[PDB]
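User: Modeling request: complex.
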Amino acid sequence: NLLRHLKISKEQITPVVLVVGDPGRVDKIKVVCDSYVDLAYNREYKSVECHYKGQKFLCVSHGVGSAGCAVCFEELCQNGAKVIIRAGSCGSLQPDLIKRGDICICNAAVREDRVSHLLIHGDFPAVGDFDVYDTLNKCAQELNVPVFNGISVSSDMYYPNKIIPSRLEDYSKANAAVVEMELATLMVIGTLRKVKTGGILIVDGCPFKWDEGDFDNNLVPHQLENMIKIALGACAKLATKYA
Amino acid sequence: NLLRHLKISKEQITPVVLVVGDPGRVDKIKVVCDSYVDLAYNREYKSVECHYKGQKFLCVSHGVGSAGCAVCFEELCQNGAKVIIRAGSCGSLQPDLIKRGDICICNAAVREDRVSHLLIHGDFPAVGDFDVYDTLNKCAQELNVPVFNGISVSSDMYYPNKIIPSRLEDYSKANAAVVEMELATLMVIGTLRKVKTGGILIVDGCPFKWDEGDFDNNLVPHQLENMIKIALGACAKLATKYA
Amino acid sequence: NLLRHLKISKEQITPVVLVVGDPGRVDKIKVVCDSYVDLAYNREYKSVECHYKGQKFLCVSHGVGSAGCAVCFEELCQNGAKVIIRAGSCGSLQPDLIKRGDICICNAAVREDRVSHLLIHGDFPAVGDFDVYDTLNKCAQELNVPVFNGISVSSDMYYPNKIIPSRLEDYSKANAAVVEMELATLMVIGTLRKVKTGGILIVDGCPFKWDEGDFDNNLVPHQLENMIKIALGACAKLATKYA
Amino acid sequence: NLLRHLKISKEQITPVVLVVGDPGRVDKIKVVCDSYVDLAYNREYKSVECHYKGQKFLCVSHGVGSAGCAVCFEELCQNGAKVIIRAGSCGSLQPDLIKRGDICICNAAVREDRVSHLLIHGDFPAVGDFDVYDTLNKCAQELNVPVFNGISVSSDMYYPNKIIPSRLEDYSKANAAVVEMELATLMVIGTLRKVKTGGILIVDGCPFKWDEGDFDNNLVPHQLENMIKIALGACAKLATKYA
Amino acid sequence: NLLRHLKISKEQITPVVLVVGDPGRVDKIKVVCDSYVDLAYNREYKSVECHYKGQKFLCVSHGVGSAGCAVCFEELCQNGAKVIIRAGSCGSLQPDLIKRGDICICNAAVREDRVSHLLIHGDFPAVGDFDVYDTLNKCAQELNVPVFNGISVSSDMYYPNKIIPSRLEDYSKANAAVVEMELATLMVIGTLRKVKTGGILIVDGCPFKWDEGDFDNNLVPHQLENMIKIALGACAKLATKYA
Amino acid sequence: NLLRHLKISKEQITPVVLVVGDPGRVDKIKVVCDSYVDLAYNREYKSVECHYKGQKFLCVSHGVGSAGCAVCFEELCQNGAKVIIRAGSCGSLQPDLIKRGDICICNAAVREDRVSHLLIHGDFPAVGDFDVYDTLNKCAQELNVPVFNGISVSSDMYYPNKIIPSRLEDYSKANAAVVEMELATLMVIGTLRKVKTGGILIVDGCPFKWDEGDFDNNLVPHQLENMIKIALGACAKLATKYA
Ligand SMILES: CSC[C@H]1[NH2+][C@@H](c2c[nH]c3c(=O)[nH]cnc23)[C@H](O)[C@@H]1O
Ligand SMILES: CSC[C@H]1[NH2+][C@@H](c2c[nH]c3c(=O)[nH]cnc23)[C@H](O)[C@@H]1O
Ligand SMILES: CSC[C@H]1[NH2+][C@@H](c2c[nH]c3c(=O)[nH]cnc23)[C@H](O)[C@@H]1O
Ligand SMILES: CSC[C@H]1[NH2+][C@@H](c2c[nH]c3c(=O)[nH]cnc23)[C@H](O)[C@@H]1O
Ligand SMILES: CSC[C@H]1[NH2+][C@@H](c2c[nH]c3c(=O)[nH]cnc23)[C@H](O)[C@@H]1O
Ligand SMILES: CSC[C@H]1[NH2+][C@@H](c2c[nH]c3c(=O)[nH]cnc23)[C@H](O)[C@@H]1O
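Assistant: Request completed. Predicted assembly structure:
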């Protein structure tokens, strides 16, 4: 019996799952694996079974935004998933240090969403599993891929208006490294559901400089590949522990 | 250039736009019109130009969740859209009155999201445009399609937990009619950017009884058809004026 | 027995009720009707039965402020009232477009009070009934009286301080049309008590320019008379339907 | 130069001012003084200069509710008033100890309004001036009138609904003595404007027992007489000091 | 049986207790009394039974901070204490009037802590007992020591950052007189536990001018002695009553 | 000059610091090190330079409560500290798995304080540094000391009351491991000041079973000894990175 919105069965769910926001990215990633098996595609949720380094793990798209990815995350977590790693893009909150193309492996996030709050009080931290976190950094090292580490601001607001000030600058001063829209939700759902989570992101611009055109419609080819290698490598290594 | 994430151009945006959640729903709607022209399909945002009753209007999918649909709505509102109508599914909060298949035309909504709050203080109301509301009702009447009218709870939480209590029962007692995940965001964004909004929904179950099987993976055919006719009819009438 | 604070019996309550802020305004209004019957006068709550176009409906003063009018509204809603229309004065939040004398028929409001929050969560919208809004607009048409439509900011703070910044500016940018002190409370109570509500206001100045003398201790003669015609006309139309 | 809503000049404002909720109560009080001079009556605000023991001080009605009384209090504080004492009715939050007829002199209050919050952060205390509190108690002492002392809950909600629970039971457990609707607002405005405030109240019932009829529409005559004696005595003594 | 953290038995607790922040201060106080008896010293909590003017009362240190002092206060309140007077240092929020070495007796405080909020809603006031307040002022008058009276801001943040603005300026404008870190917590716990509280503080600088070196590592010698005399004098007077 | 409250100079602060709550604890710790140098003891803040396994690092007591420890943490972070590890006691929030004497190395915390909120928005996470977390775990491993890992609830309330429900059960359900009073504050301050933090705690009871006598007057001897060895070992390892 398929999951309400992912449209896959519990038996099709592997212990390690790699989630991305763009359903089209799932097709781009499956092709770089040793082999793959398409499972389903419903709404913005595309699921494919990946095979990498003799290891097996799913790759599912969660779509844009916290409320949307929460549906995906909850279905994965409540049906077998043990490790969920989000791989996506992000904006730099430190323009003088982190730039387009750079990779950042995050261990925690700012809960600027609503669903995590509807799940647990705001004082609760949005934090990833440090073993998952460690696995990601090690894979990066072994591949000789320099990366940044830090906190990501997960905000439900992509396009700000001019009435209520955005908190991005505050968080930049607070030393948050990047900003995206799903990590915190994944992390909180993960801890509440005893699922190990992690996150690796690649910068595609800086929201502080969008007016000056500091935004790339497309990610830096070379680096996107490196990040995916890191991500796949990690999932493989982590999967080995449940095989 | 094209809209950053919708991947359509400014000149391709019609004054009137029909938005739905499932990108697949867009293809099912375009084939009911007299003719159409596929525009783009990026992530969960599928855009198509619809031709119905001599009128021209777009149909765009916004995806699941307030943060994701916010990306879609902002691009549309900041690039020419004058009227946006959301057509989707919802759950009944008045099970003894509103049942599966029933249709509800909502005039306002509960802002249980975060993005709208990041845009304007919570005391501000999520309310639709009367003209659009009235147009939708006048079309249902002409088609002899009975509908309900009321407030929708737009909540970011689809799958509740056992720690923090859901506010759905409170809102039911407060006389809210249904519950879905995007209307309040559409409304507030519309108001802030001077875009007229409206919404028509079809009940697919009751959240108070999911644990009892009250959920249709498939919507009621005739009802869904009648809702789309109303939706399409409403868009045609409004488009005429702007034409 | 009599309503605790209105000092009128339940049987003296008509399905349609017109409420104003100033108890003295009730006298100024009872005169222009065909005839009337004074019911009571307790504190700032003055009740009178009005006879207009062969229709019976009460006119009750509610006083200044959300907490005060809430007492009035609850006693009415819980004892027979089916429709309540507030007619009063307001300040303009769009000075370049809305000026002294202008009439605005509002469909929703900003809940900047406390009592509505003590009744239901802040995410809940303060929105009036569509028929009442429609009825009021049409009556304005019939009488060839140009009127604005929009959202009203209902704030418990009339005289601002210099420590905590007023939110009026924010709301003006958010496109709120006018500002008064009781509409949101009326709307929420009505929605909760299944009572259709509506509001029509006359501009007596702009709070952004009070330091410039932009305030009329006396409302515009013809304009006020016109608004009153509209209100009475609307009450008449609605009372007929309930008979 | 009349005050916008009180309709009196800054010249008619005495340093000490006695405020009551009911404009009718002002008349019942002025005739118990040596002499009086009616000043004005607008909306629910009736002003009268009271003469007592050779002392001159005003008695003004402020209406029901924090938002409404705030207009009164600001106009008075911003135009001369140096001392403001509120004399009114209240409900008992300690049914086994405080009953109908009993008098309570309050030194502080719970800010369950909105206007005090729009003026200053919530953490700020609603507290009366010790001097006024002390004089009121001493006057009660001299007249041999027993009285309670304690905290009053100033809540904007008089008639509660059944969705959001009331905080009255919580405050009763916290040892709040009484409940009314204007004291917290007077205290905060007083502190902010450098005006000494105080409040004396007579119990008319218990909200926990309204369903039992524990509410007297009429205040115990003798008790009310004694309270006003205490109030007028205090106003005279304080008036002397400011002479 | 000994209290968990104060390490004294319930029988050793006197009806009146003088509390100070620094355990070192306890020792400096006991020697100024007629005679004393050391009870215990655990963590930062030092207890000593003081004998003064033929009266008996304890002097206990509560440490720096609301959370830390709450532990001390609860153990005292839940085990026999009837009166608790805090004597400590503070910063001036009115640099034009209250200078270093000046003494302020406070009647209420701003609740900028967390513990009091975990105990009761924020709207509840942090207010001291009148009798204790009055006793402190009378002892000051008898000793011919001029003192200020006013509200204290009890803030958990001593060293502010540059991201979130400090509320001290707002409170100075709201007329708060001084700032320290434990009074509000004492007051709220006292009210809840029916224990009479008070506070007397000596100014050690002004947080608005720390960058100008406006801070005394050592309190004004004579002033500190004067304050302690007032403090001990008050405890003696209040202790007599329970004796 | 000296730090205002720690009373040590900037030059006396080592890059790595070990903080504990009880000042008496640093004397019990310094004695197990190779040698030490007492620096100062002011209020509840005792500082001693420890020499262990060829490295030098300070051991400083911070007292009970977040507000108090923030003073200590801020003085250290703004004056040279690069690594701060907290070693203290805690309560078990999972009494069926974590019992008296068990050791828990925490990587994140619940911000149930106030000071962290006065420094940065609540959505920000309280999370420790991975290097520190990893070092602590590796040291426990080397010493064959089993330990738990998890989130700690840092709450300013030690003794709850019966009015406002404690959120501990909620956090237990959310899978928080233990509860104490200072970790979250240390974490947030460190993230903001660019200082690496960590925490290791020994369980001395369970808040859910205090009434049934589930409290440890004294920490389990051999377990406390082991945790101290782990903490001292971690500090030395981290210190070498700055030697
Ligand atoms: C508008 S859809 C953008 C997606 N890409 C990520 C993202 C990249 N750059 C930025 C940025 O600058 N701000 C906020 N989100 C993103 C977010 O997590 C969304 O899933
Ligand atoms: C999680 S996918 C559900 C979508 N369908 C709508 C919906 C239908 N029924 C319900 C319900 O019972 N609760 C919340 N949302 C919905 C929402 O707007 C989402 O876009
Ligand atoms: C406080 S007395 C003013 C009354 N008239 C209305 C009003 C008119 N103009 C304004 C304004 O500029 N600000 C706030 N309220 C009003 C409010 O609803 C009150 O009942
Ligand atoms: C509804 S008008 C009641 C007025 N009398 C006072 C009052 C008396 N008894 C109670 C009670 O039980 N609850 C709340 N307010 C009051 C309040 O301060 C209002 O000005
Ligand atoms: C941070 S240690 C300072 C202690 N002395 C008091 C204090 C003196 N001056 C000030 C000030 O300017 N701001 C905040 N607290 C204090 C507080 O109540 C603490 O217990
Ligand atoms: C109030 S003395 C308790 C100290 N020991 C720690 C502690 C041990 N057990 C518990 C508990 O069950 N709840 C809260 N704190 C603690 C806290 O961090 C304080 O510094």
